[PDB]
Design a protein around this nucleic acid. Structure first.
Lengths: 685, 71, 75, 109, 52, 116, 138, 97
RNA sequence: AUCCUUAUGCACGGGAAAUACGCAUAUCAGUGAGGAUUCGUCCGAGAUUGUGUUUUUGCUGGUUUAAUUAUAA
């Protein structure tokens, strides 16, 4: 902005909800130099000031050059780090990595003006390459000064729906550029009209995101209308927001919310008959259309007295001091009313006591006893209030009720999705698609790849005895990595001695591992360094990255498949090497033995997944199934007993059978009910 | 059991395929019948069978009457 | 140093910065996946029963909340 | 020629192996998505176009790689790497050899 | 029109991992290796055969 | 490949000249990417803090929070952070801190001296 | 013009509107001495064949047959109306009168996006088509 | 400098991806492409038509030319050269600016 | 009797492209389609015109509980 236009003081007021109570904010009571949207004019340096800095800066340059030269040294990067950003050729130029090839570029400035002719796009900066000169301005600071000068983020978001999606804090989230969605819809085949229709949506996400302040009295004036079945008003047609709001409320969602809440409350007091001595409580019948009818209202929940109840002056959920001596009466009700608010009125409380005092003292509103509590809710902001008559054991209950509820109802939570689609905000987890059973076949593609296990790295194992109890030891652990193609393992054993002098071994472990991976890749010539390194435990995303930074090519996935690579340690030869380890070391193996020469990597990996997936289950009772033929040799070379192919047909038939049997036993779904899919998922997860 | 077998025979490949069936199999007899129909006696590289086919195609395309009506 | 249980125990998965200063646990590898797959299974059979037999769940606030709800050794 | 008919059609979904490699072209990459995701509340990375105008690459670098300016190697799809049209291809190669024999005529002489 | 047998996917080693034909893709790893391998040699034979 | 940040020319040239001259003989931190945002810098500070409080000793940990941090900023932060964790057997900590904090023959040779 | 066929009777009208099965019906109501009723006649003259698949165009002077004037409320020189399976198609232009049409559209491509857009809407049975373009200020 | 029209673009149209192809090939097998250049210099005197479309300042219409991507290469090489030498030999004096 | 070669056909394995390919009673076209240059020559088979598809052809993949009926009166 270059212009003088300032912040109407009414727009700096905001709100927040504490469990203790609503807290409010206005910074506008205190009158100061009133608030101006900072404008470009201050963020730019007059050309003079620069050029002058060009003389001097270049001077101290050439001098200090002759200084390091006077040492036969070259200018340390250090000095000029005093000031980079100043001078017309600037500085970072001199430190550009590529300068040796730019000296061979000449006459750029004549070109860059001529680019006018060769091609179309306007080139509003034609007087510099940023390679030669560097960068001639920073509008960074501007960003901040606009935010702050608008009163800090929160005071903005109060202008949004963002409370509606009810993320607690925004700090984990990413947007979705619309341009992506739009383009991703352009590669299809679209009529020119269809094409224009992709102009809109990147608005339509906007006017939602701003709908509270766009939609309000002070703005469109005009006359209200309601959306069809719901409780929202439109000061003007706003043809976008209408449609998108509809798609936020369908299946008559408004109601289903209402009912869901009320229903949950009676499910509360229902349990509470005892505590308060309430002779009963009823969900009333409701004119089905009540939830959104505004002018008039009826009660909802009915409440009874073993003897009677001492009412109070009607008060607010967060208020403390009570007068029960005020009255004594019998039987109570509740209303649940929803309003979907604006930035104009986002504060419910006043909305409550307006509706309480009104409807209570109203003629047409029908509340069987003039005793009962108003519970309203802001859908828009997730706010809630109740201004009721009061008993012992209500507020201490009810507060705890609502709290739990806002975290709970399927309904509300089906706003907080269905909206946060419309806005397309997402929580950030990881974009990287995991291996799933669908994804699975890709493993055998031609990428060099690894699996990595932290499970057995730290092992203190327990056994039962005669006297004290629980024989328990720290054990040399295994860091179990493999490449399913060549079947080379890597075991980094971590010896107990390293563990001793540290605490809180959880994190430190994972870090030990992450290093073992980084260096372990560094034991590989890049020809043999892999691409997808497939993590098991999610938490290993972070620690690998930091140590895998220098290897940008190498993508890291976790999976959803629980992979039985720890049960390998059950193997004799393995636990031999590992249990005997006196020091942390690296030990290679081929788990495939040679199944390769016999049959392809795929199967070879499959049957392996069988042996393991069972060795988490039948374990030794499976180990007999391996050992049921003594005639058959296990070399020092190999691990698995060699066989014929047929013999494996038989084995894998058995092994296959087990995991089913024991599975459908533990989980008591008979084997016979399972789809081929389902079975193999069970083999995998 | 009609429209099926109809389209089935009405399909051009089959419809030819019967017309192949009846014609003799020799170099000499067929090749004769070729040159009688005026066509080139031999096409550059073809083993006998393909020559027979080559007739059948010529018969269908032109919609000639049968080889007896040829003669 | 905190335990959950010739049995071996391994460190349970925990995030570095989310864990920060917190009590660390020792679980059995087979028992973790065991319990998790029992619970998740109980959810699946209830899915097939609900969607197949077309029954509507009671649930709501306290039930879903309780669903959100879902020994030291010296060595 | 008459514009066909506005009416949409049920999608034929045939995804082979072959057919897939023919798709990878027209469908946004992975990286090309990790542009689009704009980290909330925090200014983008942007770079300067030819024209210096800023192309936001929003998430294309995991925030650990912003602090170090590590750019990305990540994954580079060879699937959509642009390739010549048929015709143009032979004009290229053809002209290349022709110029090369002309050259070798400057080679021996 | 039904007269002929509906076709079936040819399955090679490279292709074997992919095929979602119902048949023991994992469960029988080696018995599934079997039908594939003997499938290929079925064809290959039929080639040599026909030539002869 | 067109994600614009990744490009610098000089590496390009060395790689290409080798490709060309080799062919014929057989025939016989870039400026473009904008600076680190604040709270990301804050994040790396945090994760490095957790990885430091992993092991107080084992200097490679502090070394990371030295080098990685020092790559975006350094300034006084890095120097005080390297002087802290050095509280000495490994000549490596000294190889890095020498090369860093020295800046003058006097203090250069104080990191020389106490090291010796 | 010569491409555009014309109507001489309210009988022609309602038969046409009934007797075009599968595609939109477009009718200009306007008086030959009007200005726009020439212009718009041209614009539609250039789109006739190009749309002929999913719609069809007819010219009707109010002065010829003024019958419908009362029932469809015809003011202005030129009002185009769209009928598909005998139903009056209603596409809100933001102009403030959702029914029918009034003013002049100055782009072929536009006009096509309209005839199309409405069409596609009318094939689903939605009574409201929402124009691509809000020209309201007209 | 034939690359950086694109470095923003998400979606290459047809003619583009043709160029960007060439730019990458010649950018890959240089010795060949250089040879192709040198020949073009030493002989080629005929060229494919070149296409105008006009920019706008809304005030001065300016012309805009577009050339076959091939030819554009030998050009941009040559041009690059002439400016390199010409300033190596100090042809252009001060006041041309 | 063996081999190579050549072309064509049936195949088998493998890769590549699907801005490619068609189609046409079109129209022409070694009786020159088209092109080049060092201006002496050289090269020598399709081009035009219209038209259709072309994020595709066929197929196949996964998520938005039957009837019958029994008492002592």
């Amino acid at each position: 902005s270059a212009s003088h236009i300032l912040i109407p003081a009414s727009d700096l007021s905001w709100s927040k909800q504490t469990d203790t109570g609503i807290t409010h904010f206005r910074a506008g009571m205190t009158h100061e130099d009133e608030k101006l949207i900072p404008t470009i004019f201050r963020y730019i340096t007059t050309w003079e000031n620069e050029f002058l800095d060009s003389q001097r800066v270049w001077a101290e340059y050439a001098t200090k050059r002759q200084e390091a030269i006077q040492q036969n040294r070259r200018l340390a990067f250090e000095e000029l780090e005093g000031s980079w950003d100043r001078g017309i050729p600037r500085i970072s130029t001199l430190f550009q990595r590529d300068r040796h090839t730019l000296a061979y570029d000449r006459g750029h400035r004549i070109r860059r003006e001529f680019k006018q002719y060769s091609l179309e796009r306007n080139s509003p900066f034609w007087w510099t390459n940023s390679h030669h000169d560097g960068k001639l301005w920073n509008l960074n600071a501007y960003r901040t000064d606009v935010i702050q000068a608008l009163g800090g983020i929160e005071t903005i978001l109060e202008h949004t729906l963002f409370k509606g999606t009810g993320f607690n804090s925004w700090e984990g989230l990413f947007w979705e550029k619309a341009s992506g969605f739009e383009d991703s819809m352009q590669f299809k085949k679209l009529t020119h009209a269809q094409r224009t229709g992709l102009s809109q949506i990147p608005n339509r996400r906007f006017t939602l995101w701003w709908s509270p302040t766009i939609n309000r009295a002070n703005v469109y004036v005009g006359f209200l209308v309601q959306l069809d079945l719901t409780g929202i008003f439109l000061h003007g047609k706003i043809p976008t927001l209408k449609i998108s709001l509809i798609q936020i409320f369908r299946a008559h969602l408004w109601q289903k919310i209402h009912e869901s809440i009320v229903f949950d409350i009676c499910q509360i007091l229902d349990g509470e008959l005892d505590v308060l001595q309430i002779e009963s409580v009823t969900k009333e019948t409701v004119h089905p259309r009540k939830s959104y009818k505004m002018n008039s209202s009826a009660a909802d929940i009915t409440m009874e007295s073993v003897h009677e109840w001492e009412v109070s002056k009607p008060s607010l959920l967060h208020e403390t001091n009570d007068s029960f001596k005020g009255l004594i009466t019998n039987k109570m009700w509740f209303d649940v009313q929803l309003r979907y608010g604006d930035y104009d009125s986002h504060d419910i409380s006043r909305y409550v006591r307006a509706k309480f005092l009104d409807y209570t003292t109203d003629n047409v509103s029908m509340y069987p006893s003039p005793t009962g509590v108003m519970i309203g809710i802001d859908l828009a902001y997730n706010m809630y209030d109740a201004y009721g008559n009061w008993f012992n054991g209500l507020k201490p209950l009810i507060q705890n009720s609502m709290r739990t509820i806002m975290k709970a109802n399927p309904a509300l939570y089906v706003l907080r999705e269905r909206i946060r689609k419309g806005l397309q905000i997402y929580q950030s987890s990881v974009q990287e698609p995991f291996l799933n059973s669908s994804n699975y076949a890709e493993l055998f593609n031609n990428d060099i790849k690894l699996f990595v296990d932290d499970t057995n790295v730290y092992r203190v194992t327990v056994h039962k005895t005669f006297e004290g109890n629980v024989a328990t030891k720290a054990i040399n652990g295994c860091i179990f990595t493999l490449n399913p193609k060549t079947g080379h393992l890597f075991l980094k054993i971590i010896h107990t001695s390293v563990w001793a002098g540290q605490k809180r071994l959880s994190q430190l472990a994972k870090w030990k591992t992450a290093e073992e991976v980084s260096a372990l890749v560094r034991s590989l010539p890049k020809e043999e360094q892999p691409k997808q390194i497939i993590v098991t435990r999610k938490a290993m995303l972070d620690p690998l990255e930091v140590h895998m930074l220098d290897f940008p090519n190498i993508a890291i996935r976790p999976t959803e498949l629980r992979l039985p690579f720890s049960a390998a340690m059950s193997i004799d030869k393995l636990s031999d090497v590992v249990m005997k380890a006196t020091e942390p070391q690296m030990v290679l193996f081929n788990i495939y033995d040679d199944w390769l020469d016999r049959i392809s990597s795929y199967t070879a990996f499959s049957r392996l997944t069988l042996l393991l997936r069972a060795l988490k289950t039948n374990e030794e009772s499976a180990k007999m199934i391996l050992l049921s033929d003594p005639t058959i040799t296990i070399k020092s070379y190999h691990l698995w007993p060699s066989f014929t192919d047929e013999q494996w047909i038989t084995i894998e038939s058995q092994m296959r059978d087990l995991i089913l049997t024991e599975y459908g036993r533990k989980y008591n779904v008979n084997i016979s009910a399972l789809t081929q899919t389902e079975i193999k998922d069970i083999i995998l997860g | 059991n009609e429209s099926t077998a109809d389209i089935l025979k009405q399909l051009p490949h089959e419809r030819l395929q019967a017309v192949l069936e009846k014609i003799p199999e020799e170099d000499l007899e067929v090749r004769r019948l070729l040159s009688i129909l005026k066509k080139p006696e031999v096409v550059e590289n073809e083993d006998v069978q393909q020559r027979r086919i080559r007739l059948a195609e010529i018969l269908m395309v032109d919609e000639i009457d049968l080889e007896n009506i040829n003669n | 140093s905190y335990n959950i249980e010739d049995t071996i125990l391994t460190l349970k998965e925990s995030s570095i910065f989310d864990d920060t200063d917190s009590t660390e646990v020792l679980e059995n590898v087979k028992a973790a996946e065991e319990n998790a797959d029992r619970e998740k299974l109980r959810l699946r059979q209830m899915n097939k029963d609900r969607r197949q037999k077309k029954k509507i769940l009671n649930v709501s606030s306290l039930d879903i909340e309780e669903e959100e709800e879902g020994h030291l050794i010296i060595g | 020629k008459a514009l066909p008919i506005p009416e949409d059609q049920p999608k034929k979904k045939r995804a082979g192996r072959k057919f897939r490699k023919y798709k990878e072209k027209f469908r946004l990459s992975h990286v090309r998505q990790l542009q689009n995701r704009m980290e909330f509340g925090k200014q983008e990375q942007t770079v300067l176009d030819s024209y210096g105008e800023e192309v936001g690459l929003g998430m294309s670098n995991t925030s650990l790689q912003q602090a170090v300016g590590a750019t990305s190697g990540s994954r580079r799809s060879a699937g959509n790497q642009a390739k010549l049209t048929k015709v143009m291809k032979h004009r290229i190669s053809e002209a290349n050899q022709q110029a090369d024999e002309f050259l070798i005529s400057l080679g021996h002489n | 029109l039904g007269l002929l047998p509906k076709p079936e996917p040819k399955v090679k080693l490279s292709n074997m991992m992919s095929v979602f034909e119902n048949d023991q893709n994992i469960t029988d790893p080696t018995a599934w290796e079997k039908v594939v391998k003997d499938q290929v040699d079925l064809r290959k034979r039929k080639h040599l055969e026909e030539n002869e | 490949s067109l994600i614009p940040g990744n490009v610098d020319l000089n590496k390009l040239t060395e790689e290409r000249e080798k490709l060309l001259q080799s062919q014929i003989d057989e025939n016989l931190r870039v400026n473009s990417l904008s600076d680190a945002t604040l709270e990301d810098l804050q994040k790396m500070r945090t994760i490095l803090k957790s990885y430091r409080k992993a092991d107080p000793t084992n200097p490679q940990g502090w070394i990371a929070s030295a080098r990685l941090e020092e790559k975006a900023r350094k300034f006084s932060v890095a120097k005080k952070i390297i002087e802290n964790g050095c509280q000495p057997r490994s000549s490596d900590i000294w190889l890095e801190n020498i090369r860093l904090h020295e800046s003058d023959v006097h203090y250069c040779k104080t990191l020389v001296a106490t090291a010796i | 013009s010569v491409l555009l066929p014309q109507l001489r009777t309210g009988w022609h009208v309602d038969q046409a509107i009934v007797t075009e099965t599968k595609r939109l019906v477009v009718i200009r109501f306007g008086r030959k001495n009007d200005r726009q009723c020439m212009i718009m006649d041209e614009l539609l003259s250039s789109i006739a064949e190009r749309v002929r698949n999913f719609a069809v165009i007819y010219l009707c002077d109010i002065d010829e047959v003024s019958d419908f004037d009362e029932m469809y409320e015809l003011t202005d020189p030129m009002t185009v109306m769209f009928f598909y399976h005998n139903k009056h198609m209603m596409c809100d232009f933001g102009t403030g009168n959702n029914n029918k049409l009034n003013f002049i559209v100055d782009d072929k491509q536009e006009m096509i996006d309209i005839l199309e857009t409405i069409f596609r809407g009318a094939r689903k049975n939605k009574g409201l088509v929402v124009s691509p373009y809000d020209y309201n200020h007209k | 400098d034939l690359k950086d029209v694109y470095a923003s673009k998400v979606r290459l149209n047809a003619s583009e991806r043709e160029e960007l192809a060439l730019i990458e090939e010649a950018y890959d097998n240089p010795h060949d492409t250089l040879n192709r250049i040198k020949k073009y210099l030493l002989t080629q005197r005929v060229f494919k038509p070149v296409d105008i479309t006009m920019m706008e300042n809304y005030q001065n219409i300016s012309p805009v030319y577009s050339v076959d991507p091939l030819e554009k290469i030998t050009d941009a090489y040559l041009d690059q050269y002439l400016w390199y030498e010409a300033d190596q030999r100090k042809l252009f004096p001060n006041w041309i600016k």
